[PDB]
Symmetry: C2
Subunit: 785 residues, 2 copies
Amino acid sequence: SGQNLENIKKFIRAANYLTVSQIFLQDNFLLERPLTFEDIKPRLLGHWGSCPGVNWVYAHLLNIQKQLEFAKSGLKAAFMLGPGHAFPALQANLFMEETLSKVDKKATRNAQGIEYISKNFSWPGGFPSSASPFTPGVILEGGELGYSLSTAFGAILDNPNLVMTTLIGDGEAETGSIAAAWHLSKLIDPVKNGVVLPVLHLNGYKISGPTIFGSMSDFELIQFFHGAGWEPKIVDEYSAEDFDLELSNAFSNAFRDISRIKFGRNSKFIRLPMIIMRSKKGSSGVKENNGQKIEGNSLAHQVPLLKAKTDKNELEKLENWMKSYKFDELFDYERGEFKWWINDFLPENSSRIGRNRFVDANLNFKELKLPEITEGFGEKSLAMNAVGSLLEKVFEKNPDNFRFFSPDETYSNKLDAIFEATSRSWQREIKPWEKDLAKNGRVTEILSENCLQGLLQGYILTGRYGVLTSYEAFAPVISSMMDQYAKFLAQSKEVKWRGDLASLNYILTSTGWRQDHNGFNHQNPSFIDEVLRRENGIGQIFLPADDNSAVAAISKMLKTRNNINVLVAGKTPEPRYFSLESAQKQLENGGIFVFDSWKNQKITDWDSISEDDEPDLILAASGDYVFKETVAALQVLLHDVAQVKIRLVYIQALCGKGIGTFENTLSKSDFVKIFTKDKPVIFAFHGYAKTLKSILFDYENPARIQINGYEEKGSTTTPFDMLARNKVSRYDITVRALKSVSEGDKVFGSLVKEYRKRQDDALRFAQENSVDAPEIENWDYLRFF
Amino acid sequence: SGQNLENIKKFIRAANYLTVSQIFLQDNFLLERPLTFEDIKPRLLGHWGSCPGVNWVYAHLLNIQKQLEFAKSGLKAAFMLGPGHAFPALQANLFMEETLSKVDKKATRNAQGIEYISKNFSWPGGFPSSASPFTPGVILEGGELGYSLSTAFGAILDNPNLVMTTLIGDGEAETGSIAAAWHLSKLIDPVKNGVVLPVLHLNGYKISGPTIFGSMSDFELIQFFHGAGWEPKIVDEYSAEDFDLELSNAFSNAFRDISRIKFGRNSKFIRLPMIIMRSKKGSSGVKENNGQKIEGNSLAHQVPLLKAKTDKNELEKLENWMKSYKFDELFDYERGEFKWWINDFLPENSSRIGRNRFVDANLNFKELKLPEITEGFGEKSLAMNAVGSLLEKVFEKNPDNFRFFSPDETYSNKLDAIFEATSRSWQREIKPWEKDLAKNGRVTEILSENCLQGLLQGYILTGRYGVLTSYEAFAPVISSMMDQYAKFLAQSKEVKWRGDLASLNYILTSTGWRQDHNGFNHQNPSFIDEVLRRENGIGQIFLPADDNSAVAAISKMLKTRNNINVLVAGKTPEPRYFSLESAQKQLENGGIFVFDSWKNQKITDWDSISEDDEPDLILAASGDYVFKETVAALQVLLHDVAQVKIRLVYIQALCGKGIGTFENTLSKSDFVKIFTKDKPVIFAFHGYAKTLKSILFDYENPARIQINGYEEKGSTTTPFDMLARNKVSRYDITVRALKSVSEGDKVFGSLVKEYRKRQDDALRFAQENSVDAPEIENWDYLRFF
Ligand SMILES: CC(=O)c1sc(CCOP(=O)(O)OP(=O)(O)O)c(C)[n+]1Cc1cnc(C)nc1N
Ligand SMILES: CC(=O)c1sc(CCOP(=O)(O)OP(=O)(O)O)c(C)[n+]1Cc1cnc(C)nc1N
């Protein structure tokens, strides 16, 4: 114990020394000669206040892992860093562990490695100032605060004997996501999945002020964290005779309780332990400077000596601070290597914190077994039921690497068929009249969308599969956090040892065009714009036409890696236009369907399109309801005049690089063939008009393309009134097509008046009877298969 | 007591009867004859499960208001409905009291009014199914759950006699916004302000399953809500008499409130009480149907009898359910009015819940006094310091209707000058080394952005002013909720009795181009895209060029009403420009600056632009950090080649309707004069390129416009490296301009080679020295002063 404690103290001292050397020094890293003004970095970037807590937690975790390995237990520990601004200290904890030496050859544990890791911190072309995928064993960026407990819970599923210790700052704990994630222990069974160990760094200060949790006493914190499903233990630096002994006792007790919980079963609810660690912010640093308080104050957040390159007293303070660590007793200056204590302290390579096998995606990724797609049919299209049946088959075929997440909307979205295979995860009591609740359920349901997104991202980044479904309007709640994930993917594109990962799959349904029980608060198609905004080859939206297109698309997204895909489709009975082979060929051609109505010819290959024979007008649609309105308008236009030639175009997929998919994106020359250079193009969009305008900016002649979308209007009314309020009903589409072609009002005016009268009569019937007119409800639509 | 109890019971019986009549009946509202199949609505829309709790709370609130007015107390109570899907029951509570009759003449409290409110619920053209601005006394729609506590805390400020009772659902309490807002009592003093009263519905069930909070026992709930700084009380429907217990709870809660608000004896932290009530979901309704459980189960969420128009047993169940409420003992069928008992229950006029004076925007809105604008002094311009000084003057001049909100970032954003007027609100202990903390501070700081947005919207919707500042990267966290606010404004455009409101003002600074201490996670310019997507005349972005432009813009947004404005500017020492507080203010009438470099001529009136002489190319920028690069590129181009003519265009404001402001938006004819029809336009943007592409879709000839902006690339490096990574540096701009102008690549090949070599040398110097080259650091710019 005493030799053990001495080894932890030496490890902490060395980690602190390399942290300060990373922050300040650019030369004379070993301090063999007195410090001058030429051995200081020109710009003193970085942070210091949270580093000592990171060092203490990492060293105690290494000691605990060594003890567990001696006990011959199967538990493997991993570390998660919430405060991503404390990156350099963690870097030091890797350098003396030799994890970084397995990735970079220049980071060997010697004097050259010390110089390499000290000079290149925050340097242009060196290591970044924050956590990144370039760091081994890192899955959470920590830049945007929060999203730390949910990702830790998501990485623990289906990975027993894995203990993930995550560090959460007290200022970060004031966010909504962290506050909501405390209840995630009521839905996950730790015996068959694993244990998450939370440590709260209660330094007491934010960037420039005290914290909410730092103001609370010990009694209030105990009651708050025991009101949820946690068992908290508090250790404070201000009153402890020996801080490291208390930290060792707390970690040993927590891991003993974890081992006791794993070995055995209990027919009740579990209470995972957690550690609150209170310490002075920026401990073991400069105490005072220019009469102000640094240690134990919010002024230690950034660097505490901003003028060390020009002020003599600041340089003396920095030199004394670095010499307080006594690096001569740990390092060996003669040979340039560490002494014999570091080999005694560290365990073997297979059982170290930074090289956990359960967290790595290279040792856990497997292919997904796709069942045969059965394109069953009835009388009307029900895309959500078919998607649920296919996901039920997927759940049957892959019983270890597939999961489902939803914010209590599985029945409302017509995806309940998946309950024929698996139940919903629930660790609390079940009443006899309740159904679909089990401890080992593979569906997790909670109203906090942030927790669901964190669980999905943790499960995917560990190396497995998942799909998250939701309403379309409530998606942007997890908008910004999703963008963070995208950055990770971009930062994984330049790393040669990361490996492949499953795609991030969203199923957004119950769109605003058919919200019957709610009005104007459940219609917000802005999530797809945020998905399409990113430009690092990430972002795909799938726009099915019927149930066959829906099952083809949901089969396509499960075969894609390292991307983000969103599928938006309705859940109401709908007409059917395409069979299985036509839908599959359309998806393999990008997702564009072209039809000529004056000759009744479907075109699925862009070759053999006649230049001598071109359409007079183009009607294009994107989305199921707008496609129904477009085909109804095309039917009316074929009935009435039939002298002009109309080409019908439907788009099934959109990507950040243009029209179609990333693998097969429509080019600038095929757009000219599909869409004629000068003919008008009336376009109906499921979402905002500017979302399509941004994509169509880069294509040929954007002046003639009229685009109509949601336009942010509507209330609780009939579906036809909802379509007519935003000028995307069939009659206004026909009016626009008549006015866009030839003179318009000169010859086709009376038809415009007749169509407006028909729309007025339909709206009057809907207003008077609260149901749609029988002319629209019993409409006879077109067929293509 | 007993007379009051039976009057309350009669009120709740009437409320339940009108709620069911609103949900189901189309005719025979008084049930004079036996119910048939022709008196049922064709579509049964609405919700029922949460309505009885709303009715109980409203009746007890009215009783407690009458009892308060008996003793001549100044406290005025208001009601807030979190579960917005429970709208019809609240409507019933607005019918027996004559609040709805003051707005609508047809809603008079008689038989015709009963028919009017029952027939038109969820009808096309009638009352909506959810809460809306059309309802008097409503400031929160309740569509997106979780924004109820923070809005109440925002609306409760500077109103010492307003007590707001808000209803929160147990499923809604699982959202992170509510869990973050539970701690808001530690920053707002309830003696000089009002008291927010939270009530937890706790019916036990979500849409399709149990709730997390419903699974917790009483002991766990007591600990969780005591640890957060509240005084919870529990009443359950499984008791002898629910109404007597509820009345005792409300009476004791009001006694504590009056004993704490007017004595002022306590100087330490306070403990606001809250009410936790437990009841069966959909109480006093259908018990069983088709062998399933309805009352006390999640199946009572929507309509519990979905086939009452076709099934005889369902119709009989509905008739028995409605006849369970004996409406004959509360109504006179021949007179058509209520009996005398209601006149003994309702309090005096204007002492009623639905007509609170402290909540209405009318009778509380006052114009803001703008101090005189002053110019900036010095070579380098600091926009944030000038903005802070102007806000300090505003705080001085308006000591009762202005407040500031920030997520612990006002020191880092160079806005600390406002600390010369007011401190930060803080109700906890203050250390001797801590500064800018006071109980009566007018600045609220917490890391939860959702709480800040809720406080700002609550303050603004009651008829006062406020400004919220933040980083640009973490703004999208509050994107979607902001969209909800915009919808409110749109509905307020169609309500004739709703008064004016102050604009929603954002200041986002520390942009991604100058994140020195942070890396990739702190660059995300997507919030302005979310704001610009509103299409109801809402959404304005202000893009200052220097400090004078910043103060002119911040003076302009404080003079705008019923809108949303965003101001984005840097905080680094930047060169000054045309802005001398006079030319800048003249530019603000249009928001666009035009300069001709071949004759050194500024243009402020667009009708003076000569059509005979035209620029050879246009360099345009939007944002200060890239305006620097484009004026440097203009300087280099003027130095090297003089036979070409360059027109410099800067844009200061963008709106959803086009270029400029809503009051003065650039037309499609002025765009042709400013931007020539066929000349190339090299445009450089502060944010994403597609955000500007969507706006420029609607203008003339968008094919020739080369838009470059942030490309999601960068790391911890020098500012010039950050500019060059996204191809928006000065050398990139001049290379692009040379490529655009030149007919062939062999005329300016030496120049582009030289500029590429110069950029390579600058990047090499930055890589080797970690400091920008002296050629760039000591650059000499031009001025239009
Ligand atoms: C650099 C950065 O992004 C930091 S660090 C920091 C204070 C962290 O509080 P904490 O007490 O948990 O940290 P610690 O004392 O060092 O442990 C803030 C508010 N920010 C900016 C910020 C703002 N808001 C959000 C959601 N995320 C971030 N990162
Ligand atoms: C219709 C709608 O938008 C409702 S109602 C409702 C149940 C609310 O649970 P709670 O028990 O707290 O309310 P109560 O049953 O009425 O008492 C949900 C989940 N939703 C959809 C939904 C989903 N997610 C979010 C953030 N908001 C909403 N409104």
